[PDB]
PDB file of C-alpha atoms in Angstrom:
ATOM      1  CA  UNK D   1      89.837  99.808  84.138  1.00 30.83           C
ATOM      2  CA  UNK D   2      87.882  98.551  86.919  1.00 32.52           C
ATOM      3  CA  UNK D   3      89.014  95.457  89.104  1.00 33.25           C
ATOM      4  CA  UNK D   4      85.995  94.091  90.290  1.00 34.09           C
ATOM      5  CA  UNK D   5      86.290  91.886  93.781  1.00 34.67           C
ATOM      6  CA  UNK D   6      84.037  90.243  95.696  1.00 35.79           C
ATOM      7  CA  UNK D   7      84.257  90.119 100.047  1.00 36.62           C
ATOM      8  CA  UNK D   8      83.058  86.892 101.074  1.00 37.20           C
ATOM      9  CA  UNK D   9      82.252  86.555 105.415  1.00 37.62           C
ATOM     10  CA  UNK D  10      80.990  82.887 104.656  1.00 34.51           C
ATOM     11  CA  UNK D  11      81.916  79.591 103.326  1.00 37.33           C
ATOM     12  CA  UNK D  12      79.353  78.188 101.142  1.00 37.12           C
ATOM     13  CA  UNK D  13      80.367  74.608  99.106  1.00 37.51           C
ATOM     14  CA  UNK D  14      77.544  73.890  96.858  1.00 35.52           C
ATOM     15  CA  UNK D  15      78.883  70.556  97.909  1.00 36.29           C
ATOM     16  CA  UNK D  16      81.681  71.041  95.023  1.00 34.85           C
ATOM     17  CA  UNK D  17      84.820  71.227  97.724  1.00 35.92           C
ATOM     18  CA  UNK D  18      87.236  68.499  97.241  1.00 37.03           C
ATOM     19  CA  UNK D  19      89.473  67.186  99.852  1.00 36.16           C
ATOM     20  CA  UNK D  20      93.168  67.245  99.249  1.00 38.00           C
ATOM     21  CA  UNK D  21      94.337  66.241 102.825  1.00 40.36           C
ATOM     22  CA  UNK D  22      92.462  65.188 105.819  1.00 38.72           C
ATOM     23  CA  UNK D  23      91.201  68.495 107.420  1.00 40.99           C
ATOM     24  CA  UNK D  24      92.045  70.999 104.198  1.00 40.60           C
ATOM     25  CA  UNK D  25      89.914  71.269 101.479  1.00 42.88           C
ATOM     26  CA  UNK D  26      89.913  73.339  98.468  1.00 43.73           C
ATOM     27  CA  UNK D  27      86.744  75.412  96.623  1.00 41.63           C
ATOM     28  CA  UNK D  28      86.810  77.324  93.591  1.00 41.72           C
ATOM     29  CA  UNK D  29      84.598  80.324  92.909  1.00 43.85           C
ATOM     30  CA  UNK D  30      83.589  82.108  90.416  1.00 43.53           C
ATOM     31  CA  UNK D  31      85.052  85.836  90.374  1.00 43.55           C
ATOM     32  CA  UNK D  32      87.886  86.913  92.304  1.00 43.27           C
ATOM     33  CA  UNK D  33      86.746  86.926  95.990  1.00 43.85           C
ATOM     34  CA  UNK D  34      88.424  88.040  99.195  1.00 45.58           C
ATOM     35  CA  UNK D  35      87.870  85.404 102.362  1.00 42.43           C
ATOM     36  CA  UNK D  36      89.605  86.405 105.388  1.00 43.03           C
ATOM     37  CA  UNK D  37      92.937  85.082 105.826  1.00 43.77           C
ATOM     38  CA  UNK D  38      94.342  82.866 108.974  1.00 41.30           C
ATOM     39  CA  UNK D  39      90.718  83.748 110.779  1.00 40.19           C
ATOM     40  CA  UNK D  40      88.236  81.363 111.822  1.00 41.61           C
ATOM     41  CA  UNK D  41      84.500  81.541 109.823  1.00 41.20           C
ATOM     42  CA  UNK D  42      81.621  79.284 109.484  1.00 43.12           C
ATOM     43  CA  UNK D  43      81.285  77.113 106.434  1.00 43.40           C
ATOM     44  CA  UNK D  44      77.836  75.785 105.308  1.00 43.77           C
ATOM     45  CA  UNK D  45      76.610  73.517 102.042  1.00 43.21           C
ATOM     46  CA  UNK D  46      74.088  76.321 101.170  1.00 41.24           C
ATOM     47  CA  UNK D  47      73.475  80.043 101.269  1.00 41.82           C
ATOM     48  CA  UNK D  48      70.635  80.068 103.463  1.00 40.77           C
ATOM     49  CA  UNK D  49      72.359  76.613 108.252  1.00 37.86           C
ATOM     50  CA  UNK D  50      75.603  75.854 110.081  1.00 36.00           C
ATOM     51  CA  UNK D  51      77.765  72.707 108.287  1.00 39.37           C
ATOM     52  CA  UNK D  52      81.388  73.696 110.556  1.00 39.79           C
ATOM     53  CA  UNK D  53      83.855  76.118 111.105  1.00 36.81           C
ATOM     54  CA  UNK D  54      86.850  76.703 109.219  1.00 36.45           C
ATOM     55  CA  UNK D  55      90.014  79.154 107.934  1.00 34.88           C
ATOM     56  CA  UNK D  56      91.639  79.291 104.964  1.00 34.49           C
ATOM     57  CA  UNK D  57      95.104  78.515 104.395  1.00 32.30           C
ATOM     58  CA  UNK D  58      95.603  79.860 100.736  1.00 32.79           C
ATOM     59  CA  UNK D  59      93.946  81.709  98.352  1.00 31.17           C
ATOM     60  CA  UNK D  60      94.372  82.535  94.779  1.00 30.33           C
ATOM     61  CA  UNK D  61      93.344  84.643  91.736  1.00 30.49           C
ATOM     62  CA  UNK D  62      93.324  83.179  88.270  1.00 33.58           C
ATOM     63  CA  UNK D  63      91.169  83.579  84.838  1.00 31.92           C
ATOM     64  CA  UNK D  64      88.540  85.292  86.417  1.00 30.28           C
ATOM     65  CA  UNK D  65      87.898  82.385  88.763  1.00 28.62           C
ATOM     66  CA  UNK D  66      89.213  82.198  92.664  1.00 27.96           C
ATOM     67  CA  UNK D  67      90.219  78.989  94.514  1.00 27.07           C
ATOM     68  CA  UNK D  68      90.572  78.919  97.989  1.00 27.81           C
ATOM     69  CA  UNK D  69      92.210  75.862 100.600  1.00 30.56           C
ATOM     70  CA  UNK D  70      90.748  76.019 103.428  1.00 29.11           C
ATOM     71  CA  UNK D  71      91.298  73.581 106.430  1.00 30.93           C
ATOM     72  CA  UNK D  72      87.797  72.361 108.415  1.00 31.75           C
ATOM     73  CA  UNK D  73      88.511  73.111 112.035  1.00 31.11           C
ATOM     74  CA  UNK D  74      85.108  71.268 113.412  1.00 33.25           C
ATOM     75  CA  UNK D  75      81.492  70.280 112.303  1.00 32.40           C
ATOM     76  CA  UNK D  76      78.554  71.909 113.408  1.00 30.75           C
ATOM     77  CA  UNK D  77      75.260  70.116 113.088  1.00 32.07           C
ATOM     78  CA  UNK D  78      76.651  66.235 112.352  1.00 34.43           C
ATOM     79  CA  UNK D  79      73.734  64.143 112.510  1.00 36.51           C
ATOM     80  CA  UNK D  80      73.532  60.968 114.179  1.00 41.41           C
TER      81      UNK D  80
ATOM     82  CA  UNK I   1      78.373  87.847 102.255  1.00 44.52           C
ATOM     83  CA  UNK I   2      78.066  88.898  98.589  1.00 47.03           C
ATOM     84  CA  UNK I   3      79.331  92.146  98.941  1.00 45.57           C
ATOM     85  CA  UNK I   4      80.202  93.517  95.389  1.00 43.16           C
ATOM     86  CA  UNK I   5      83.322  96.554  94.933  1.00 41.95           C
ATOM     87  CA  UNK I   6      85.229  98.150  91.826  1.00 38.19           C
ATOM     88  CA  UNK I   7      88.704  99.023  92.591  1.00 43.76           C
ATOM     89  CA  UNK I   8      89.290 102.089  90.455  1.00 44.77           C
ATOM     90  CA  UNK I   9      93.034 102.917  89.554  1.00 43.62           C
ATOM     91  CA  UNK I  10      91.816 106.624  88.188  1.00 45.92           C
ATOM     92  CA  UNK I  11      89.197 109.610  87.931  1.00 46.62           C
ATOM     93  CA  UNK I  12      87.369 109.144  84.796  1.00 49.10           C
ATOM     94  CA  UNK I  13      84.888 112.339  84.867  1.00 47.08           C
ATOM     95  CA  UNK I  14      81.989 111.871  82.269  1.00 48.00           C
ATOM     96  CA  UNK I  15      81.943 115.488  82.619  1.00 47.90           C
ATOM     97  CA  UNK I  16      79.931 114.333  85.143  1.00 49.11           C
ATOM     98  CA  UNK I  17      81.848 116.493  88.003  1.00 47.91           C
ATOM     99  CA  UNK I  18      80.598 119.096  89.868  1.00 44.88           C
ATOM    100  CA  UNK I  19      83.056 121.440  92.014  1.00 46.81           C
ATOM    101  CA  UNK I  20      81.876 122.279  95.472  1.00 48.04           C
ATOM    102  CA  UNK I  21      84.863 124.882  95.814  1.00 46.38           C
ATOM    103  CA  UNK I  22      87.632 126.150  94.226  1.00 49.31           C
ATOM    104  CA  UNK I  23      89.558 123.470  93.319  1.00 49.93           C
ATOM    105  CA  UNK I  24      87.776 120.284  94.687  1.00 48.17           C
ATOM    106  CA  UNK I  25      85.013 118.243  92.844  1.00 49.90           C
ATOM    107  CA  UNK I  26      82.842 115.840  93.493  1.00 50.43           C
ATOM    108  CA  UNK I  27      82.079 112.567  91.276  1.00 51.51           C
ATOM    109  CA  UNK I  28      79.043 110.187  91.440  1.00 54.19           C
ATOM    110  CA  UNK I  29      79.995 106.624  90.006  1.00 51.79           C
ATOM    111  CA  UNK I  30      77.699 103.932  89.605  1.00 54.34           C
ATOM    112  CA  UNK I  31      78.507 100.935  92.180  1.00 52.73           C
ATOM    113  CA  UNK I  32      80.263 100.577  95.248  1.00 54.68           C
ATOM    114  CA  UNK I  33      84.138 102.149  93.993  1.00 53.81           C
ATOM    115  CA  UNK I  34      87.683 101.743  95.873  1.00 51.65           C
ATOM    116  CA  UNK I  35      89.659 104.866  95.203  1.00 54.14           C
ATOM    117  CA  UNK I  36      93.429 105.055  96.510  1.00 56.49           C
ATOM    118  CA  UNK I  37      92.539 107.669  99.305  1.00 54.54           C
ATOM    119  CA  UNK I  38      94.747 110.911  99.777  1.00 53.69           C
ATOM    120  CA  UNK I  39      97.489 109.508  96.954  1.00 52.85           C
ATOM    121  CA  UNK I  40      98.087 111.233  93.719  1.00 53.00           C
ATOM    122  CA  UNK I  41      95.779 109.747  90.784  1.00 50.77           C
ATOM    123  CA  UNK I  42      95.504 110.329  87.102  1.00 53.37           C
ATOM    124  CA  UNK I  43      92.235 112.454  85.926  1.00 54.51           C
ATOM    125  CA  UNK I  44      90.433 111.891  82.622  1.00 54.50           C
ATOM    126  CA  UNK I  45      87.461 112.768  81.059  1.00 56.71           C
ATOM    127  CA  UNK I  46      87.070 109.783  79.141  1.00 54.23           C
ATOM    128  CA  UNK I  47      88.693 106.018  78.507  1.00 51.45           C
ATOM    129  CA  UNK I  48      90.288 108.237  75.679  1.00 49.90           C
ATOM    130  CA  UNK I  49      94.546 111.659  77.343  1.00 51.03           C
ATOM    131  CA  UNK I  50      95.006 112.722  81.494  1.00 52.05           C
ATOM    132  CA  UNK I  51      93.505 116.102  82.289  1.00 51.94           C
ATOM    133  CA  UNK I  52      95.346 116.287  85.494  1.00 53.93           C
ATOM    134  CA  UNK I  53      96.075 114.889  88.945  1.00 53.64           C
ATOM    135  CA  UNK I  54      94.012 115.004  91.939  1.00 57.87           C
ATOM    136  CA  UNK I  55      94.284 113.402  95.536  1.00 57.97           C
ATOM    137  CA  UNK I  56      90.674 112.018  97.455  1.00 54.10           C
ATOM    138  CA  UNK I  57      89.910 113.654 100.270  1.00 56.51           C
ATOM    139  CA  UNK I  58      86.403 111.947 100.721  1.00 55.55           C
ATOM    140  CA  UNK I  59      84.414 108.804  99.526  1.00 56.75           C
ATOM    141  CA  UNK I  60      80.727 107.742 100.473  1.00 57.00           C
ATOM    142  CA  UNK I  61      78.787 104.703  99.537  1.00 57.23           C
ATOM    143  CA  UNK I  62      75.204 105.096  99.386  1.00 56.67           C
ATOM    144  CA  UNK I  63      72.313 103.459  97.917  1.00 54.74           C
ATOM    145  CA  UNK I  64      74.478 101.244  95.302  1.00 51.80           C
ATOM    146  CA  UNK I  65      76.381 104.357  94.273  1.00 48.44           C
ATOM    147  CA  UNK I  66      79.583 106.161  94.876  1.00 47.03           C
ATOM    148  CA  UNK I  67      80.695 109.773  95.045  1.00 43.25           C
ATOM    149  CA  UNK I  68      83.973 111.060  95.804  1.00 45.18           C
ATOM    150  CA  UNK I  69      85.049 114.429  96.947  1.00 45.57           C
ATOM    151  CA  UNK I  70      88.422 115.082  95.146  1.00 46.07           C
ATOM    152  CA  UNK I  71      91.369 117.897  95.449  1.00 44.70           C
ATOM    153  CA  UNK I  72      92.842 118.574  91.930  1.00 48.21           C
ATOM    154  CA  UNK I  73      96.752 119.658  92.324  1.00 49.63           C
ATOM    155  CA  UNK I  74      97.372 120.044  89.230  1.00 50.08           C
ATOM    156  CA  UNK I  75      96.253 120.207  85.159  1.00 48.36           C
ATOM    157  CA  UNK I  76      97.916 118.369  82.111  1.00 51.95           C
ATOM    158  CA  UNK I  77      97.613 119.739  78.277  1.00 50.26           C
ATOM    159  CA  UNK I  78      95.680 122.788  79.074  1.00 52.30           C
ATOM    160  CA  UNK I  79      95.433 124.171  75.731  1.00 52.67           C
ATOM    161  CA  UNK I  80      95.355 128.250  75.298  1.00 55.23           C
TER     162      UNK I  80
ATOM    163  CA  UNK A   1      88.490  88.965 112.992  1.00 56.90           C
ATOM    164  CA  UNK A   2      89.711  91.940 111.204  1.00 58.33           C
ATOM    165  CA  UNK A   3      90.943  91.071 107.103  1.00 60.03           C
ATOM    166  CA  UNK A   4      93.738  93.346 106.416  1.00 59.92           C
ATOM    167  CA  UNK A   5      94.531  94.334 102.603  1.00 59.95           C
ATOM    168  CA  UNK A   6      96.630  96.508 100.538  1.00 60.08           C
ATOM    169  CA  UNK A   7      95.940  97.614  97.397  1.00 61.98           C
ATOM    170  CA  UNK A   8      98.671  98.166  95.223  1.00 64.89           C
ATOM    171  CA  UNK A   9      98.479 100.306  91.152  1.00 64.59           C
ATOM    172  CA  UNK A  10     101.629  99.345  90.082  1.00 62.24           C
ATOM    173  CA  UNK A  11     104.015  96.561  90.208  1.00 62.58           C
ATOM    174  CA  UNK A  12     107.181  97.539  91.707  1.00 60.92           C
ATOM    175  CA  UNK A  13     109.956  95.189  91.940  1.00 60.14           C
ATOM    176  CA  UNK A  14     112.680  95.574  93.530  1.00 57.32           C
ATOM    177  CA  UNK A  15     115.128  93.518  91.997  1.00 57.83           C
ATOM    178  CA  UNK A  16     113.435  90.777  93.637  1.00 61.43           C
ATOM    179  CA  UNK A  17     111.277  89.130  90.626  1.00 64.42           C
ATOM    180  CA  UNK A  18     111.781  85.939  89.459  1.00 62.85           C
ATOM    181  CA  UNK A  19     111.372  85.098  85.424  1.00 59.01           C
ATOM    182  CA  UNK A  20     109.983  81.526  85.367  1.00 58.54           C
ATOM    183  CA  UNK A  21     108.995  82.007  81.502  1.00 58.67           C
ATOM    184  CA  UNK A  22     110.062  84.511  78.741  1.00 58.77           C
ATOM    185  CA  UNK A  23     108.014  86.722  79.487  1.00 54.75           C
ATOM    186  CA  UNK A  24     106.177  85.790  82.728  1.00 52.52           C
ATOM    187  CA  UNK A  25     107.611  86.546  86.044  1.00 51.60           C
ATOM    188  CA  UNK A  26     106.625  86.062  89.728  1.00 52.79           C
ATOM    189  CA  UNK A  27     107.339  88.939  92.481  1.00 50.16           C
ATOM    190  CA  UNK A  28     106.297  87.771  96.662  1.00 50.97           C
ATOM    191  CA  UNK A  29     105.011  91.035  98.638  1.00 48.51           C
ATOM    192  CA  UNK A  30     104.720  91.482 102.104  1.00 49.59           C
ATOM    193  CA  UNK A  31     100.935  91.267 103.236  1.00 48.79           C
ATOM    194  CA  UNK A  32      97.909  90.373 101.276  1.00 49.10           C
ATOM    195  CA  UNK A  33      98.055  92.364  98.471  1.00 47.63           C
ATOM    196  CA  UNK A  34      95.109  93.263  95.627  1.00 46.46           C
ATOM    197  CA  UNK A  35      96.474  93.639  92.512  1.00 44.41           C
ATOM    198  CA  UNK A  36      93.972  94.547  89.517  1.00 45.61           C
ATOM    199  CA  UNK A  37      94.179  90.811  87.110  1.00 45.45           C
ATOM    200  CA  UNK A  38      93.681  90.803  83.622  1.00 43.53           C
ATOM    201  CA  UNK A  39      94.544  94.815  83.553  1.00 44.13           C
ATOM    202  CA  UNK A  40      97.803  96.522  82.055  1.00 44.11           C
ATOM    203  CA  UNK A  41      99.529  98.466  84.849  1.00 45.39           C
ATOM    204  CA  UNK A  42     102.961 100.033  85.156  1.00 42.46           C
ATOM    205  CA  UNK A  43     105.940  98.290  86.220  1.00 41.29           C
ATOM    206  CA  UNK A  44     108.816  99.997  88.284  1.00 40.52           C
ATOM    207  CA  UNK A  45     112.070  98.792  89.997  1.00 38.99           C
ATOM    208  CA  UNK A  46     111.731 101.382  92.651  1.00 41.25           C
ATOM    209  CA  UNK A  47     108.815 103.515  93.612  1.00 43.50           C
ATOM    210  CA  UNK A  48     111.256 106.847  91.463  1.00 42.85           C
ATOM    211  CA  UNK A  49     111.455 105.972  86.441  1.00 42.61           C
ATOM    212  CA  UNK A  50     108.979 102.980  84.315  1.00 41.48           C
ATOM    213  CA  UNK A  51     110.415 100.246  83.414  1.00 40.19           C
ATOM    214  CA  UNK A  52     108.033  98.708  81.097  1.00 41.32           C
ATOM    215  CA  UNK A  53     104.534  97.640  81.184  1.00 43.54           C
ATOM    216  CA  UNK A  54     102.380  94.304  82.178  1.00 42.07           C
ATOM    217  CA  UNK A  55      99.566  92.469  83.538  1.00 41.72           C
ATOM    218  CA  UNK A  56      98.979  89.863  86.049  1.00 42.81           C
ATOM    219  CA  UNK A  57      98.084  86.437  85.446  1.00 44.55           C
ATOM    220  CA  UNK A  58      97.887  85.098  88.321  1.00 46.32           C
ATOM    221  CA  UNK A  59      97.334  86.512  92.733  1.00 48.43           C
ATOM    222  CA  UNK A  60      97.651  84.001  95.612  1.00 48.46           C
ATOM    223  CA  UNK A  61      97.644  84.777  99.687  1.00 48.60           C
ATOM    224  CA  UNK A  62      99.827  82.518 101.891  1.00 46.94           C
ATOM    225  CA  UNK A  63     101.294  83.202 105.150  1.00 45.58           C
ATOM    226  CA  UNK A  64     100.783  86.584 105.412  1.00 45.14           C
ATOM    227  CA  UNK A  65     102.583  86.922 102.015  1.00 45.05           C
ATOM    228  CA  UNK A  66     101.199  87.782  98.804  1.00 42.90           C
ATOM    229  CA  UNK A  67     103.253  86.066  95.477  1.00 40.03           C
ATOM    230  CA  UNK A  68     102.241  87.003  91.613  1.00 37.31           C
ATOM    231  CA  UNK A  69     102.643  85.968  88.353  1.00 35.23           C
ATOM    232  CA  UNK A  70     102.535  88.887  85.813  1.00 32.22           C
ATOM    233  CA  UNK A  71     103.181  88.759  81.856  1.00 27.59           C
ATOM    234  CA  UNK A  72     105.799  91.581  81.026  1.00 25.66           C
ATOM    235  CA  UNK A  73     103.490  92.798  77.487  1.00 24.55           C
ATOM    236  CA  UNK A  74     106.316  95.499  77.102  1.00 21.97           C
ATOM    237  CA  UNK A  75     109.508  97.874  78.024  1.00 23.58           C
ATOM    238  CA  UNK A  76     110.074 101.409  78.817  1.00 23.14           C
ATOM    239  CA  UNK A  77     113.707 103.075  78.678  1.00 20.83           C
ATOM    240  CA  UNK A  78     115.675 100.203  77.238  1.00 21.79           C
ATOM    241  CA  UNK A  79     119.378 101.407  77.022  1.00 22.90           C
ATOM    242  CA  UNK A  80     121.513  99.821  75.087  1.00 20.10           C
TER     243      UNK A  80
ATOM    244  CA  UNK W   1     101.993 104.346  98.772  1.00 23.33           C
ATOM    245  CA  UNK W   2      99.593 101.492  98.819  1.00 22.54           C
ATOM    246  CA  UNK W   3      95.942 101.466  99.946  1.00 22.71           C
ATOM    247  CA  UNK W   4      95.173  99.734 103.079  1.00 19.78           C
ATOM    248  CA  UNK W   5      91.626  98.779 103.928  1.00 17.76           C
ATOM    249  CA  UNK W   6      89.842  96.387 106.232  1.00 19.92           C
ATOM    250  CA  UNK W   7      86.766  94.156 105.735  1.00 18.13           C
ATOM    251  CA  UNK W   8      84.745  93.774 108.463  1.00 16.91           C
ATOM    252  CA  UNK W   9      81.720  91.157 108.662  1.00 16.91           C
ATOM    253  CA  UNK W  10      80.308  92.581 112.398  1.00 18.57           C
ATOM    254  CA  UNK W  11      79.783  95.280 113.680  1.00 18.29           C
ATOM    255  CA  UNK W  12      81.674  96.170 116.814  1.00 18.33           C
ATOM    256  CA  UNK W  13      80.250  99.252 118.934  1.00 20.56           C
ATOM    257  CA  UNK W  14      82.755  99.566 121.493  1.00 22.23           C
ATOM    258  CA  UNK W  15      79.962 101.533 123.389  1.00 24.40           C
ATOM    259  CA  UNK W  16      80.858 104.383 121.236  1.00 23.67           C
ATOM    260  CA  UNK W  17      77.978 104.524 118.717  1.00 22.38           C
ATOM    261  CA  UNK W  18      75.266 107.749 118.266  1.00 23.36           C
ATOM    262  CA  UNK W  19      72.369 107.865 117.617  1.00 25.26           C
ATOM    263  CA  UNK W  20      70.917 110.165 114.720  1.00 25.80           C
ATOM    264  CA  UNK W  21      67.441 109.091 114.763  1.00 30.13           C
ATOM    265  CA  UNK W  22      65.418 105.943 116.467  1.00 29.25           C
ATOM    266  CA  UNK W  23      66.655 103.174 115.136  1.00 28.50           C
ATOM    267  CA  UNK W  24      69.795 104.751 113.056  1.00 30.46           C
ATOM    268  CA  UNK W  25      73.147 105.037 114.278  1.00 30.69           C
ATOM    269  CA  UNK W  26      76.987 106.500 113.502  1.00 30.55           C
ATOM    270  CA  UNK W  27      79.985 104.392 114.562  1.00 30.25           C
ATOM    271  CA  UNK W  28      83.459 106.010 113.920  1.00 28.15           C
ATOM    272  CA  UNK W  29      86.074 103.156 113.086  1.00 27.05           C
ATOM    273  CA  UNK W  30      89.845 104.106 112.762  1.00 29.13           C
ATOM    274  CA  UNK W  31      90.962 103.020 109.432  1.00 30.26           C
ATOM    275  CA  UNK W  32      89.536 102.792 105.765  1.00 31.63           C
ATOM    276  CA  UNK W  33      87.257  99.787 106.387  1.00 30.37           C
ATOM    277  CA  UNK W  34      84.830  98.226 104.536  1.00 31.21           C
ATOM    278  CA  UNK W  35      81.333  97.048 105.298  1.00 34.51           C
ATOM    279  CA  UNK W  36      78.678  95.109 103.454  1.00 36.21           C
ATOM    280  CA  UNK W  37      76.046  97.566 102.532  1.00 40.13           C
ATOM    281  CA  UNK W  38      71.991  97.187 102.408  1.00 40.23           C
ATOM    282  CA  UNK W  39      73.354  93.602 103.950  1.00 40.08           C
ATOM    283  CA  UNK W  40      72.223  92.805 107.121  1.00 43.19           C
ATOM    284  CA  UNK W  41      74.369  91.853 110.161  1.00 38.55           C
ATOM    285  CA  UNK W  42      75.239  91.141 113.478  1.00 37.14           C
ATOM    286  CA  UNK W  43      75.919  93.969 115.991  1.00 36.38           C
ATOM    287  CA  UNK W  44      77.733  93.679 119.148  1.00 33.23           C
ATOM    288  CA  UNK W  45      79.313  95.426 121.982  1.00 31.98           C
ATOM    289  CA  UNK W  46      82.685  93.699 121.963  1.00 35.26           C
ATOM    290  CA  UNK W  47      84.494  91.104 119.932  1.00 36.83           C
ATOM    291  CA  UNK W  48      83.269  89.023 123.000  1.00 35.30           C
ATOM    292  CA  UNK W  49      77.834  88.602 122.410  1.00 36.08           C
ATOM    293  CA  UNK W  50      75.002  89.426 120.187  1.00 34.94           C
ATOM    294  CA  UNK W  51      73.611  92.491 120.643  1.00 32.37           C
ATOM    295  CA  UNK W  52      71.192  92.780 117.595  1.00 33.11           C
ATOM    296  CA  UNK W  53      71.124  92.886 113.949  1.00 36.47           C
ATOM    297  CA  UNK W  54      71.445  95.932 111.375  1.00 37.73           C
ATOM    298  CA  UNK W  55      72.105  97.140 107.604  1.00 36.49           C
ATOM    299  CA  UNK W  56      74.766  99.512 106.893  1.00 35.69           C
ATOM    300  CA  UNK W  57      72.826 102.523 104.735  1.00 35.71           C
ATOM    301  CA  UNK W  58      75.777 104.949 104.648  1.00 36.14           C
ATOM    302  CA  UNK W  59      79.772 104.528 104.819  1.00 37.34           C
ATOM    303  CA  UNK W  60      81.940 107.399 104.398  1.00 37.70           C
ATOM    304  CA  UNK W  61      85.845 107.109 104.290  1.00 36.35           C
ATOM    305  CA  UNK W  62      87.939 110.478 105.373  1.00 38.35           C
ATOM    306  CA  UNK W  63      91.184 111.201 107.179  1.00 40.89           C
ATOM    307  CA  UNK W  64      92.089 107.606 107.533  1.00 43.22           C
ATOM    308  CA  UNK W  65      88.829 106.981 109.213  1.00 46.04           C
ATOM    309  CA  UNK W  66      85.876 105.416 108.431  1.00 46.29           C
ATOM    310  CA  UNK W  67      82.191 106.543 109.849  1.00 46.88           C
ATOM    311  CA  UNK W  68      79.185 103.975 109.239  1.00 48.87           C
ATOM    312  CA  UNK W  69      75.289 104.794 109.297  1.00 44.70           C
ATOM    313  CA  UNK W  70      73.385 102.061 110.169  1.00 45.39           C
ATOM    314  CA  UNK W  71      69.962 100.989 110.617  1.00 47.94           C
ATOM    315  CA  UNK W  72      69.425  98.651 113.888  1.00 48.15           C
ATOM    316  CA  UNK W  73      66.722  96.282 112.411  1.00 46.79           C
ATOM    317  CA  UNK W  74      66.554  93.701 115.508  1.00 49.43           C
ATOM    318  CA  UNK W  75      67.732  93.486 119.410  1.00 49.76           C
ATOM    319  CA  UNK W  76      68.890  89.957 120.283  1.00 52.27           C
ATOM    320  CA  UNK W  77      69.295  88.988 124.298  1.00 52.29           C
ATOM    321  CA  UNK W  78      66.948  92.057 125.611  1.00 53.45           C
ATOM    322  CA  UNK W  79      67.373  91.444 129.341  1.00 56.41           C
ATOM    323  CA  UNK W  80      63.775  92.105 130.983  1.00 56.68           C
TER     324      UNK W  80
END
């Protein structure tokens, strides 16, 4: 018994996303984790700025781990 | 943002339960706990044969923990 | 924003799984569903009557839609 | 029969809030929601901006609505 989940308001990549498309991107987590659906959210490389906004197209549950494809709508702080 | 939850699919009672009234109870779990509110659940007192039904009428989250205020409609194997 | 979810204690299919396997089959839901993973649950083809036991294997959110892939470990009533 | 929650990463006081003490307040939600806890947040007056940050201390779920205690730990644009 017990189904432990986790609710997730941010994107964080440790810089481990990988690009599938152009815009959408996928990141795998560890744990199952809930990210809202079809809603807009901010994505950053760590915990702590702003790296973009994005919204996740899919989401899945499997061994534990969670994957989510998400699709970068814009960058925030793009240097130079 | 890292916010932790245990989906429970039943009342396990560590004999643990204290009754406020006649035939409602109240159980502390450890944790942050999902309970299916006001629908008809199993009620045991251990991992181990159901000791009855019972339907949430209240659940609080405080200070890591969890306690639930439950209605019990009904008892199983109630020995003589 | 606003992430709506449903959490579901049973697997009820109504006539509408798929068996992509022997013993694996896939069932889509309407709305993002939590199911518990890893956990035995009961399986019914409507929600009145068990029809066997099994566990998921796999969740995934698309489209408003929830799909998943469950192991059938066993059956209830099998006539014959 | 399922169980229908919502996550919620802000905290929307549509002007409807109470305060219990100085810097603790109630808001009343409709719906079983869900609400990081001892995590803190941003508050605001409508979907629309930032009104101030708090942490969530207590969340209580009971006839399919949800009523959250929280501590206001910051004001953002204080006009004069």
């Amino acid at each position: 018994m017990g189904m432990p989940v986790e609710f997730n308001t941010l994107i964080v990549t440790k810089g481990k996303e990988v690009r599938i498309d152009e815009n959408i991107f996928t990141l795998e987590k560890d744990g199952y984790r809930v990210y809202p659906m079809e809603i807009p959210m901010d994505v950053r490389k760590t915990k702590f700025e702003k790296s973009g906004t994005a919204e996740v197209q899919k989401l899945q549950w499997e061994e534990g781990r969670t994957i989510i494809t998400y699709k970068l709508t814009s960058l925030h702080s793009v240097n130079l």
